[PDB]
Amino acid sequence: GTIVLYAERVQDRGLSAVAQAESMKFKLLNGLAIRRAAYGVVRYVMESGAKGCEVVVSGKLRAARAKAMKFADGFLIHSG
């Protein structure tokens, strides 16, 4: 009784970093292509009124050597 929990939907997930990581995770885990999964996530984020958004995917798919990919659209400052 001295501790209380409440849930709470979140005003657009499209502007939550965490929301979209877990989306990607679920996308690639659900056996989705890669560029599909990324560009999809980016284009929903942008569509959700973002100023800019960037998705890196690192590690290894199918080939034995690791690679990485940048997926980005719009605007981002990086400093200060």
Partner RNA sequence: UAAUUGCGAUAACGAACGAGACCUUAACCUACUAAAUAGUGGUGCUAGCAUUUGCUGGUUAUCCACUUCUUAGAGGGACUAUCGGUUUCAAGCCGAUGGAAGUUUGAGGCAAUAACAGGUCUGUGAUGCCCUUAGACGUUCUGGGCCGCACGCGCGCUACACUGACGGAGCCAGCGAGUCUAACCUUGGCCGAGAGGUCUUGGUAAUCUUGUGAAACUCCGUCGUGCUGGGGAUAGAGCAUUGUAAUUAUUGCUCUUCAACGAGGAAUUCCUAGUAAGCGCAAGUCAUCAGCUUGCGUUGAUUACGUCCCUGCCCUUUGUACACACC
Among 24, 57, 65, 71, binds RNA (CB under 7 A): 65
Instruction: Give the burial string for 22-52 (b: 16+ CB within 10 Å, else e).
Output: ebbeebbeeeeeeeebbebbbeebeeeebee
How many residues bind to another protein according to rule CB under 8 A? 10
Least separation in angstroms between CB 75 and another protein? 17
Stretch that binds another protein, among 1-9, 41-49, 62-70, 71-79 (CB under 8 A): 62-70
Q: Return the closest-CA partner of residue 33 out of 53, 62, 74, 73.
A: 62
Query: Which one of RNA, another protein, none interacts with residue 75, CB within 5 to 8 A by kind?
Result: RNA
Residue 21 touching RNA (CB under 7 A): no
Q: Give strand pairing partners of 70.
A: 56
Give the binding site for another protein (CB under 8 A): 34-35, 60-65, 67, 69
